[PDB]
């Protein structure tokens, strides 16, 4: 295994050094504004040594932004796909490229057999090509990997399935910003190349000017460079045919047919196109090769790429002839012209990178060696590109919420071959799709309109049903003794309690356990552990009763404590925001202990009086001028008093002190150490009168954020034995510091109302020595170093925080994990902050049409985790990355894949089972089964069950850290007959595992394994 702490990786260019180094300067430079005037020696290229021109057409298209996947299927990819197929039949040398298969397969199964069969010939022949085959081409930013890997699997299944292909080459040219986390995967996917196109405009220049936008790209902590993919990134502003042919939009326009006016189209530099013919011909083609032949000089092999293409373009027949003819008669012209030197043709991305390397092997070209990411992107002067990083944030929660469930859906209902009449694999199916849909580039990203929101939203939500069922079916198979088991797989056995989901204050949704004597005495419940290690974690369920006891199925008592059911209302009486207690609801919570990926159950019986085993917490109500707020049966009377600090500890964990707002002021890791300076504080950035306004994708800030006025928030202080809890009502946030013995929880409930123009920022200011350094994650997989430029202006500081951050000196770190993607950066030393939400009057002129006004409540999860780092081993300082410590990383898992809970339906579970899994291996921490997913159906013979295993990088600090089996995923299942390692689509055999025993992988590597069952 590579050591990816101690080995800083020789990369010729590396990202974070090249910006330290980088002016950023925005000159015009001419026709080329963000670069030069390109000059080369016609001499360059000769009979013996030609420029080999490929022009690949294509066409964007999004599985929804202005119009939904549906309406932009019905009114135009249809048209475009049907249309395709005719003309490439009829037209042997045109050539076509395709990325979003979520479209194809749409198309697809609605063709005849007759078409379905051309459809497959002109893919088999290579007029139509697929590239990246993933159901779409997903946002790199906010995006997690696994559903990055999700999304690519579905969209390339597909594929090898019905056109039994499988690209090797990616095409990726419009997410807003590009992820290292995408080669990462890629590469381990059997790609050989990958395209990018949207980095910041001034790092366009600076490669261009040194050839360096073809390299080598590799991980950030990749020493050896086993992770490399060759990746190309197009020079300059847009993929559109303007900005494809050369330098200068002015003459490439010419070239773009489609705009002389029966379209509705023309080129905004007032000169349009004209229809090539023998007269003008030659005069034509001297313009193009021109063009070409500067655009040749930012790259090192004589073989170029042309892509010929835009949004939603090859319609219309009359579109296809017009840019085919015309192409043909200069091709036909150029390639006769030996004075020209050049050889062009229609041809597919893959035909591109194969000469490309053709050249590399022939000796004519070596490629530069790089490493880091290209965020944050920047197209113009300071638009960066930080916004959608926030933009719909209650979508961006909710993408991580569903992501979990697919995967604890596919997990659970992956231990047995289910009969076709479950519905199992239609209704995992619809799940993988509907969010493998919102990993599009206009999804999660937050910058579709209204309306196509609404779309993901119910596709979502029908997913989340979809996962429910399988995963209820599935414990009541695992759970029930076999001879008993009776399954209606169109019922309800039981209903899922998720307590962070929509979340209190966002969506009244989990049910009531209703016990009483005269109806009901118990109740069983069941958790699911998704990850493979044994794990405690405290749980909560509404009761109707506070006179409720806990035991597990050993009728062992399990301590467990009651607390009110708190909801808070904006009073729009008294003015004031405040919580009311429900006189008929409780929450009982308790510590649950679940096997590696299994299933515990315990019961919950009510009693006549405070049972043993169940304690009850004390509840302030901090504010001038309170009132009575009594709780029914609850035990403990509700205490009042004016605000004040006040200062909490559960357990043994750390002793947190907050203000008389209820705000973080400290927090202290041991009754030793000392009370460590870190401040909770909500501000506001607000949008600027003058200029560019800030939309849904660009955040351009009036200036520093100014402090939200909070005035005399009501604050609510729970404490108990098990769980303690501080909840304060500010304007547009009801903040909450939930302890239970370790890091504490942060819970926000964000709804920004009609603050029309503002963008709310939670931030937190300590004492860390950090100067400009700062860490963030990128997909949830890796961790970056960023640094803070104060040569850039504040929204470029901004980066994607879709799971992580923190900052450290010599001695101390912070670290926030999130249970949602969101913006955030390191404005100056010592501190933290991540966006909330942001309401938005206007469009940001980026096609959108719209600002951000259809905000709603969302409630935000975190954990904050304080921790001293003097005696981890840590990278050295020019090393690029990061790495969390076990408790940051447990934290984070915490987050994203908590305990599942499930609450009986009917009355009696005859034949109740306990425990399942307790066999099942506790693998080592840093070690997680990303995917656990049947592969076949029950017809099959042999049965295969496909495994994803990521092995993150923990710091080792001293902890020694012991005693965990070792997993073999391969056994996980009885009756092996073979394991195999794949590609982590599982679509490719890579090796047959001896022993049939899949080996664990290494640090900050991810393997596939697919093991056969007879
Ligand atoms: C799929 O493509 C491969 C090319 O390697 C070919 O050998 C095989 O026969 C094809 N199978 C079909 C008919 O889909
Ligand atoms: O995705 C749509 C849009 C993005 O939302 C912002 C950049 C320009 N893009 C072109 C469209 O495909
Ligand atoms: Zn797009």
């Known amino acids: 295994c590579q050591d990816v702490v101690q080995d800083v990786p020789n990369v010729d260019v590396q990202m974070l050094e090249l910006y330290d180094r980088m002016s950023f300067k925005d000159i015009d430079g001419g026709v080329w504004k963000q670069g030069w005037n390109i000059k080369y020696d016609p001499l360059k290229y000769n009979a013996h040594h030609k420029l080999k021109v490929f022009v690949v057409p294509h066409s964007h298209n999004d599985p929804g932004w202005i119009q939904t996947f549906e309406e932009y299927y019905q009114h135009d990819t249809k048209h475009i796909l049907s249309n395709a197929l005719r003309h490439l039949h009829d037209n042997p040398e045109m050539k076509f490229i395709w990325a979003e298969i979520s479209y194809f397969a749409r198309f697809y199964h609605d063709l005849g057999e007759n078409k379905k069969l051309q459809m497959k010939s002109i893919v088999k022949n290579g007029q139509l090509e697929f590239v990246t085959g993933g159901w779409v081409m997903p946002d790199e930013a906010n995006s997690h990997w696994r559903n990055v890997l999700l999304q690519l699997t579905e969209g390339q299944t597909w594929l090898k399935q019905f056109m039994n292909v499988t690209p090797t080459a990616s095409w990726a040219i419009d997410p807003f910003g590009h992820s290292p986390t995408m080669p990462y995967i890629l590469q381990k996917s059997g790609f050989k190349n990958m395209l990018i196109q949207r980095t910041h405009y001034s790092v366009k220049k600076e490669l261009a000017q040194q050839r360096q936008l073809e390299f080598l790209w590799r991980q950030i902590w990749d020493n050896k460079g086993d992770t490399a993919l060759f990746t190309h990134m197009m020079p300059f502003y847009s993929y559109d045919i303007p900005h494809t042919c050369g330098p200068d939009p002015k003459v490439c326009c010419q070239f773009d047919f489609k705009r002389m006016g029966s379209f509705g189209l023309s080129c905004p530099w007032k000169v349009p196109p004209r229809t090539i013919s023998d007269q003008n011909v030659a005069a034509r083609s001297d313009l193009l090769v021109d063009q070409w032949k500067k655009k040749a000089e930012l790259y090192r092999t004589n073989v170029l790429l042309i892509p010929l293409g835009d949004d939603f373009r090859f319609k219309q027949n009359t579109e296809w002839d017009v840019q085919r003819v015309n192409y043909e008669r200069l091709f036909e012209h150029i390639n006769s012209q030996a004075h020209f030197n050049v050889q062009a043709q229609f041809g597919t991305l893959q035909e591109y990178f194969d000469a490309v390397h053709q050249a590399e092997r022939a000796g004519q070209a070596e490629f530069p060696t790089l490493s880091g990411d290209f965020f944050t992107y920047a197209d113009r002067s300071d638009n960066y590109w930080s916004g959608y990083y926030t933009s719909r944030p209650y979508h961006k929660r909710m993408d991580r919420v569903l992501m979990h469930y697919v995967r604890a859906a596919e997990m659970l209902s992956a231990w047995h071959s289910w009969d076709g009449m479950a519905r199992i694999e239609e209704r995992l199916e619809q799940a993988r799709r509907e969010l493998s849909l919102f990993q599009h580039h206009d999804g999660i990203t937050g910058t579709a309109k209204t309306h196509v929101v609404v779309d993901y939203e119910q596709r979502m939500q029908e997913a989340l049903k979809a996962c429910q069922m399988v995963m209820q079916q599935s414990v009541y198979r695992l759970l029930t003794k076999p001879s008993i088991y009776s399954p209606d797989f169109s019922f309800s056995y039981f209903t899922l309690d998720d307590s962070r989901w929509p979340g209190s204050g966002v969506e009244d949704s989990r049910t009531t356990i209703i016990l009483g004597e005269d109806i009901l005495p118990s109740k069983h419940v069941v958790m ?100 009575s707020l009594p709780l029914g049966q609850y035990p403990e009377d509700v205490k009042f008093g004016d605000p004040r600090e006040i200062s909490l500890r559960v357990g043994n964990g750390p002793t947190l002190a907050f203000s008389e707002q209820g705000l973080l002021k400290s927090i202290q890791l041991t009754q030793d150490s000392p009370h ?15 200029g560019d306004r800030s939309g849904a994708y660009l955040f351009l800030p009036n200036g520093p954020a100014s402090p939200v006025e909070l005035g005399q928030p009501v604050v609510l202080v729970t404490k108990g034995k098990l769980e303690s809890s501080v909840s304060v009502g500010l304007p547009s946030v009801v903040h909450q510091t939930i302890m239970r013995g370790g890091a504490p929880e942060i819970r926000n409930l964000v709804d920004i109302g009609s603050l029309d123009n503002t963008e709310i920022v939670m931030r937190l200011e300590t004492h860390i020595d950090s100067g400009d350094i700062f860490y963030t994650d990128l997909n949830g997989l890796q961790f970056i170093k960023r640094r803070r430029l104060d040569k850039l202006p504040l929204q470029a500081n901004y980066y994607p925080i879709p799971s992580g951050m923190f900052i450290e000196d010599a001695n101390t770190r912070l670290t926030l994990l999130t249970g949602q993607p969101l913006g955030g950066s390191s404005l100056a030393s010592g501190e933290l902050e991540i966006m909330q939400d942001r309401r938005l009057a206007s469009d940001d002129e980026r096609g959108l049409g719209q600002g951000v006004l259809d905000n709603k409540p969302v409630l935000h999860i975190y954990r904050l985790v304080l921790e001293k780092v003097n005696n981890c081993v840590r990278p050295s300082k020019l090393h690029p990355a990061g790495y969390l410590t076990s408790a940051a990383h447990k934290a984070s ?34 070690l997680d089964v990303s995917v656990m997913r049947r592969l076949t159906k029950s017809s099959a013979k042999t049965q295969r069950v496909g495994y994803v295993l990521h092995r993150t990088n923990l710091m080792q600090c001293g902890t020694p850290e012991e005693h965990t089996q070792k997993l073999d995923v391969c056994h996980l299942l009885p009756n092996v007959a073979r394991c195999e390692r794949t590609t982590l689509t599982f679509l490719q055999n890579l090796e047959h595992l001896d022993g049939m025993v899949a080996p664990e992988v290494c640090p900050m590597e991810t393997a596939a394994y697919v093991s056969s069952h007879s």
């Open 528 to 627: 699911h552990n998704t990850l493979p290690h044994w794990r405690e974690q405290l749980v909560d369920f509404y009761v109707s009763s506070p006179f409720v006891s806990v035991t597990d199925l050993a009728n062992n008592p399990v301590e467990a404590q009651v607390s009110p059911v708190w909801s808070w209302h904006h009073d729009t009486l008294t003015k004031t925001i405040h919580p009311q207690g429900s006189t008929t609801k409780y929450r009982i919570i308790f510590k649950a202990r679940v096997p590696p990926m299994g299933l515990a159950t315990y019961v919950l019986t009510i009693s006549d009086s405070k049972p043993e085993h169940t304690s009850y917490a004390s509840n302030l109500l901090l504010r001038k001028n309170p009132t």
């Open 676 to 690: 460590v300076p870190v401040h909770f504080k909500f501000l506001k950035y607000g949008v600027r009168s003058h």
């Open 893 to 926: 898992q915490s987050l994203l894949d908590p305990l599942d809970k499930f609450i009986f339906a009917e009355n009696e579970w005859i034949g109740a089972q306990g425990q399942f899994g307790g066999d099942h291996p506790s693998a080592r921490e840093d």
